[PDB]
Amino acid sequence: TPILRFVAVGDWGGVPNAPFHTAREMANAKAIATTVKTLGADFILSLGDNFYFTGVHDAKDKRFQETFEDVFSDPSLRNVPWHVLAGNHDHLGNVSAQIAYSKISKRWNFPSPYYRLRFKIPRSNVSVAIFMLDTVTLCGNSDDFVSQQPERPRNLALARTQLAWIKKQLAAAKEDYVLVAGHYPVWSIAEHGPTHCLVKQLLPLLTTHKVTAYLCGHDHNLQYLQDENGLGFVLSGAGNFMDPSKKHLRKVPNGYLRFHFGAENSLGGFAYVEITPKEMSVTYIEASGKSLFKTKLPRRAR
Ligand SMILES: *[C@@H]1O[C@H](CO)[C@@H](O[C@@H]2O[C@H](CO)[C@@H](O[C@@H]3O[C@H](CO)[C@@H](O)[C@H](O[C@@H]4O[C@H](CO)[C@@H](O)[C@H](O)[C@@H]4O)[C@@H]3O)[C@H](O)[C@H]2NC(C)=O)[C@H](O)[C@H]1NC(C)=O
Ligand SMILES: NC(=O)CC[C@H](N)C(=O)O
Ligand SMILES: NC(=O)CC[C@H](N)C(=O)O
Ligand SMILES: NC(=O)CC[C@H](N)C(=O)O
Ligand SMILES: NC(=O)CC[C@H](N)C(=O)O
Ligand SMILES: NC(=O)CC[C@H](N)C(=O)O
Ligand SMILES: NC(=O)CC[C@H](N)C(=O)O
Ligand SMILES: NC(=O)CC[C@H](N)C(=O)O
Ligand SMILES: NC(=O)CC[C@H](N)C(=O)O
Ligand SMILES: NC(=O)CC[C@H](N)C(=O)O
Ligand SMILES: NC(=O)CC[C@H](N)C(=O)O
Ligand SMILES: NC(=O)CC[C@H](N)C(=O)O
Ligand SMILES: NC(=O)CC[C@H](N)C(=O)O
Ligand SMILES: NC(=O)CC[C@H](N)C(=O)O
Ligand SMILES: NC(=O)CC[C@H](N)C(=O)O
Ligand SMILES: NC(=O)CC[C@H](N)C(=O)O
Ligand SMILES: NC(=O)CC[C@H](N)C(=O)O
Ligand SMILES: NC(=O)CC[C@H](N)C(=O)O
Ligand SMILES: NC(=O)CC[C@H](N)C(=O)O
Ligand SMILES: NC(=O)CC[C@H](N)C(=O)O
Ligand SMILES: NC(=O)CC[C@H](N)C(=O)O
Ligand SMILES: NC(=O)CC[C@H](N)C(=O)O
Ligand SMILES: NC(=O)CC[C@H](N)C(=O)O
Ligand SMILES: NC(=O)CC[C@H](N)C(=O)O
Ligand SMILES: NC(=O)CC[C@H](N)C(=O)O
Ligand SMILES: NC(=O)CC[C@H](N)C(=O)O
Ligand SMILES: NC(=O)CC[C@H](N)C(=O)O
Ligand SMILES: NC(=O)CC[C@H](N)C(=O)O
Ligand SMILES: NC(=O)CC[C@H](N)C(=O)O
Ligand SMILES: [Fe+3]
Ligand SMILES: [Fe+3]
Ligand code: NA
C-alpha cells in the first residue's frame, strides 16, 4: 500500500502559432487531469520538447502561459509539481529561461539542465532516485544535423562533465529504485530511432549500475522495450504528435521491443508509473483514456 505515482509525458510543447496548442496536447492535458483525479499522481515528469518549435525567448515569454499553464489548467492538476528536462527544440531557444521560470511558477521545477531527484515512497523506507539528464548537451542537438541525429555535442567539456556526473552518481546511488530520464532514446524503432551517443556512452552505465529503467521521448509515439538484462525502456513522446514510423525497427536488437503504439489517428498518450516496495509498474494510457499496455519492473534492492 505505500506507493509513489507519477505521469511521464514527452514532446507536449504545442505550436508557436495561435492557439499555441494542438488537439493532441489538449486531449493529453484532459487525459492526464482525469488520470490524476482517478488514480492520483505525486508529480509529472516532462521528457522534453516543452515548447515547439524553437523553445522560449526568456522567462517571461508568453508561451509559458499559452502552451503550458493554460493548457494543463484543469483543477485536479492545481497542486501537482512538474519536474522538467529539455529537448532539442527547447535548446534551439533559451534554456536558461526555462530554468529561471522555476522561480515564477511554483509547480514548474527545472533547477538545472541535469539534476538528481530523490523520493521516499510514502509509508515506507523504500527510496527512488530519478536522474534527469540533458541529452542535448550530452550528445548534441539533433536539429544541427541533416540526419536529425545528435552526431556530436557543440561543447566537448560540457558533454564530458555531465557524463562524469552521471558515472559518479550512478556508482554512488543507494536507492532501491534508480530511474534515469532524458529526451533522446537509447532504443526506439521509430522515426529517430536509437541515439548512438546514448547507446555507446550511457547504456553501459545503466547496465553496470543496475538502473531500473530509462525514460525518454523524442520519438513521437509510445514504446516499451526491455533488454536481456531486464533493463526497461519507457518511451513516452506522444503529448503533442503521433508519428507511426517504424523506420528504425531493424536498428533495435530483436526481442527488445515489447509494446509499440503510434497510430496516426490516435490523439497520443503518456506513461503512468507506480512504484511500491514490491515492484515498479508502468501503464501506457492513450489520450482517449484507454489503457494500452501495462508491465512490471523489479525492485533493484539496496
Ligand atoms: C534567456 O532568458 C533569461 C531569463 O529570462 C534572460 O535573462 C533575463 O534578462 C532580463 C532582461 O535583461 C532580466 O530582467 C530584467 O532585470 C532588470 C534588472 O537589471 C529589471 O530591472 C528589468 O526590468 C524590466 O526590463 C526592462 C529592461 O529594459 C524594464 O524597462 C521593464 O520595464 C521591466 O522593468 C527586468 O526584470 C532578468 O534579470 C534576466 N534573468 C536572468 C535569470 O538572468 C536572458 O536575457 C535570455 N537570453 C537571451 C539570449 O535571450
Ligand atoms: N496521496 C496519497 O494517497 C498518498 C497515500 C498513498 N496511497 C500511499 O500509500 O503512500
Ligand atoms: N494532487 C493530487 O491530489 C493527486 C493525488 C496525490 N498527489 C497522491 O499522490 O495521492
Ligand atoms: N518554427 C521555426 O520558426 C523554426 C523551427 C526549426 N527550424 C525546426 O527545425 O524545428
Ligand atoms: N489558472 C491557471 O493559470 C492554470 C494554472 C494554475 N496556476 C494551476 O496550477 O493549475
Ligand atoms: N552548465 C550547466 O549545467 C548550466 C547551463 C545553463 N543553465 C544553460 O542551460 O544555459
Ligand atoms: N533537485 C536538485 O537537487 C537540483 C540540483 C541543481 N543542480 C542545483 O543545485 O541547483
Ligand atoms: N525535490 C525532491 O524531492 C528531490 C531532491 C533530492 N532528494 C536531492 O536532494 O537531490
Ligand atoms: N535501502 C532503502 O532505502 C530501503 C530499506 C531497505 N531496502 C528495506 O526496505 O528493507
Ligand atoms: N552543450 C552545448 O554545447 C549546448 C547544447 C548544444 N546543442 C550541444 O551540442 O550540446
Ligand atoms: N534551421 C535549422 O536547421 C534549425 C537549426 C538552427 N537554425 C540552429 O542554429 O541550429
Ligand atoms: N555549427 C556547426 O557548424 C555544427 C555544430 C555541430 N555540433 C558540429 O560540430 O558538427
Ligand atoms: N567546476 C566548478 O566549479 C563547477 C562547474 C559547473 N558544474 C559547470 O560545468 O558549468
Ligand atoms: N519526423 C521527424 O521529426 C523527422 C523524421 C524524418 N523522417 C527523418 O529523416 O528522420
Ligand atoms: N536519428 C534520425 O533522425 C535518423 C537517422 C538515420 N539513422 C539515418 O542515418 O538516416
Ligand atoms: N548486446 C547487444 O547486442 C546490444 C547492442 C549493442 N549495445 C550495440 O552497440 O548495438
Ligand atoms: N563509429 C562508431 O561506431 C564509434 C566508434 C567505435 N566503432 C565504437 O566502438 O563505438
Ligand atoms: N531493474 C533491473 O534490475 C534492470 C537490470 C539492470 N539495469 C542491469 O542491466 O543490470
Ligand atoms: N506523419 C508525419 O509525417 C508526421 C506525423 C506527426 N508527428 C503527427 O503528429 O501526426
Ligand atoms: N522538424 C520539425 O520542425 C519538427 C517536426 C514536428 N515535431 C512534427 O512532427 O511535425
Ligand atoms: N537497416 C534498416 O533496414 C533500417 C535502417 C534505417 N533506415 C537507417 O536509416 O539507419
Ligand atoms: N549495424 C546495426 O544493425 C546497428 C546500427 C549501426 N550502428 C548503424 O548505424 O548502421
Ligand atoms: N489521422 C489523422 O489525420 C489524425 C489527426 C487528427 N487531428 C487527430 O488528432 O486524431
Ligand atoms: N476505430 C478505431 O479503432 C479508431 C479509434 C481509436 N480508439 C483511436 O482514436 O485511437
Ligand atoms: N507499482 C506496482 O507495480 C505495484 C502494483 C500497482 N498497484 C499496479 O498498478 O500494478
Ligand atoms: N485493452 C485495452 O485497450 C484497455 C481496456 C480498457 N478499455 C481500459 O482502458 O481499461
Ligand atoms: N489495468 C490498467 O491498465 C489500468 C490502469 C493501471 N491498472 C494503473 O494502475 O494505472
Ligand atoms: N491483458 C490486457 O488487456 C493488458 C492489460 C493492460 N491493462 C492493458 O489494458 O493493456
Ligand atoms: N503487448 C503487446 O504485445 C501488444 C500491446 C497491447 N497492450 C496488447 O496487449 O495487445
Ligand atoms: Fe519532439
Ligand atoms: Fe525531440
Ligand atoms: Na517552481
Swiss-Prot record:
Record-level GO BP terms: iron ion transport
Gene3D superfamilies the UniProt entry points to: 3.60.21.10
Disulfide bond entries: 139-197
Residues spanning the membrane: none
Annotated binding of Fe cation 2, by residue: 49, 88, 183, 218
Free-text cofactor note: Binds 2 iron ions per subunit.
One GO cellular component, as annotated: extracellular region
Catalytic class of the enzyme: hydrolase
Gene Ontology MF: a single term: ferrous iron binding
Record carries keyword Secreted: yes
Function: Uteroferrin is a phosphoprotein phosphatase, synthesized in response to progesterone. It appears to function in transplacental transport of iron in pig.
Protein name listed in UniProt: Tartrate-resistant acid phosphatase type 5
Organism: Sus scrofa
Lineage: Eukaryota, Metazoa, Chordata, Craniata, Vertebrata
